[PDB]
Amino acid sequence: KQELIESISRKLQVLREARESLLEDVQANTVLGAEVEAIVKGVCKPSEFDKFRMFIGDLDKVVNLLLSLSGRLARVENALNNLDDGASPGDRQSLLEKQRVLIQQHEDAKELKENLDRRERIVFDILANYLSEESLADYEHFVKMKSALIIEQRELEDKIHLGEEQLKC
Amino acid sequence: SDLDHDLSVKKQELIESISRKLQVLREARESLLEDVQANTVLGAEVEAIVKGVCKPSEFDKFRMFIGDLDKVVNLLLSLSIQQHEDAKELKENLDRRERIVFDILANYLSEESLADYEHFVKMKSALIIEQRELEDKIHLGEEQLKCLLD
């Protein structure tokens, strides 16, 4: 048993360094977004700019909340997958109803995500008339890496917290 | 024990009054649902008009806005810090959207149809708000009775 504490205390640090590197990526993609923003503001009409900014913000928020709901839903579902083996009286129903509402909120968030995809294409369309193929490339890559980065970040954070709670017991 | 009796009296009276108030609130809720339905059919009317007159892209933007509205408001109320603040910015951006949609509809539509759009939205939010407020008052009064009756 005593070896697990050291092994996990090692992989945990591995994942921590991974969090640091991924954070550096967050900074890079951030300044990249600031430069894309600078260009759009510099070439696009004010309204179009407002639409662009709205899109990036709404993207951040939507992807965030969607990932949160996905997480909590996984926690509940897995809590039932592990609890059905065990025995507890009356507590399953509460997790069933909470599962229900979380499914509602999650499907809502997924609809918002879809709307934000079609929006994304609107923004790309209004940018395609002004920007270059290089600037459009930096834009597409900017958004894609934004979503991917925040996702992977929250996943890693889940794993490291899981390890912490694992050695605490 | 005279003041004890006085307490039983005043407490019972307040119980009856609270109960009546809860009846008023419930009636207000059920009557509100009717308004929700009416504004819903109105919404479908505006949707069909915009559908027939507008382009598929502009129409897609209109539908997107309408879909996002109820969701954003629902979140702001379900929360009302990171979560709630996100809801706040999404609300502001949602208002700016609203003005975009209104601007692309103002030229296509007529005067009365446009008034139907504006009203439809105003009530689309107002009704969710008022409904939340009602559930709040009802919850409060219920808990107060739970405390007084015991």
Domain boundaries, chain A: 1-169
Distance CA B78, CA B135 (A): 12
**In contact, B21 and B139? CB cutoff 8 Å:** no
The overall longest dimension of chain B from CA atoms, in Å, is 79
Report helix, strand or coil for B80: coil
Reported resolution, Å: 3.3
Residue at token pair 């600078």: A38
The chain A residue lying nearest B61, using CA atoms, is A119
Distance CA A157, CA A163 (A): 10
Distance CA B43, CA B66 (A): 9
Strand stretches in chain A, DSSP E: none
Check CB contact under 8 Å for B67 and A118: no
Residue A78 CA: distances (Å) to CA of A9, A157, B79: 25, 18, 25
Query: How many pairs of residues across A and B have Cβ atoms under 8 Å apart?
Result: 31
Torsion sign, CA atoms B41, B68, B78, A105: positive
Distance to chain A for B18, nearest Cα, Å: 30
- Find chain B residues with C-beta within 8 A of A50's C-beta: 96
Q: Which tokens sit at A63?
A: 């992807």
Distance CA B61, CA B76 (A): 22
Suggest the residue from A112, A121, A125 to mutate for an interface test with chain B (most B CBs closer than 10 A). A112
> Which own/partner pairs from A78-81 qualify as long-range (CB within 8 Å, at least 24 positions apart)?
none
Measured from the Cβ of residue A59, the count of other Cβ atoms closer than 10 Å reads 20
Task: Look at phi and psi of residue A90 and say left if phi exceeds 0, alpha if psi is from -120 to 50, else beta.
Answer: left
The chain B residue lying nearest A54, using CA atoms, is B93
DSSP state of B81: -
- Find chain A residues with C-beta within 8 A of B61's C-beta: 122
CA of residue B5 relative to chain centroid, distance:
43
Suggest the residue from A115, A117, A119, A122 to mutate for an interface test with chain B (most B CBs closer than 10 A). A115
Report helix, strand or coil for B15: helix
Query: What angle (nearest 5°) sits at the alpha carbon of residue B55, between those of residues B67 and B115?
Result: 60
Distance CA A26, CA A20 (A): 10
Q: Is B94 exposed, middle or buried (0-12, 13-18, 19+ CB in 10 A)?
A: buried
Residue B19 CA: distances (Å) to CA of A57, A83, A135, B28, B123: 46, 41, 65, 14, 29
Amino acid (1-letter code) at residue A90: G
DSSP state of B55: -
**In contact, B141 and B18? CB cutoff 8 Å:** yes
3-state DSSP percent of chain A in helix, strand and coil, to 5: 90, 0, 10
**In contact, B19 and B74? CB cutoff 8 Å:** no
Query: What angle (nearest 5°) sits at the alpha carbon of residue A5, between those of residues A11 and A149?
Result: 25
Buried b (16+ CB within 10 A) or exposed e, A104-129: ebbebbeebeebbeebbebbbebbee
Q: Which tokens sit at B111?
A: 């005067």
Distance CA A60, CA A105 (A): 17
Residue B103 CA: distances (Å) to CA of A12, A66, A131: 54, 30, 25
Distance CA B40, CA B32 (A): 12
Measured from the Cβ of residue B87, the count of other Cβ atoms closer than 10 Å reads 21
**In contact, B60 and A118? CB cutoff 8 Å:** yes
**In contact, B93 and A58? CB cutoff 8 Å:** yes
Q: Tell me how the structure was determined.
A: X-ray
Radius of gyration of chain A (CA): 21
Distance CA B141, CA A169 (A): 43
The residues on B that touch A, with CB distances below 8 Å, are 60-61, 64, 67-68, 71, 74-75, 83, 86, 89-90, 93, 96-97, 100
- Find chain A residues with C-beta within 8 A of B90's C-beta: 57-58, 61
Check CB contact under 8 Å for B86 and A64: yes
Report helix, strand or coil for A131: coil
The overall longest dimension of chain A from CA atoms, in Å, is 64
**In contact, A105 and B72? CB cutoff 8 Å:** no
The chain A residue lying nearest B63, using CA atoms, is A115
Residue B115 CA: distances (Å) to CA of A4, A158, B109: 69, 49, 10
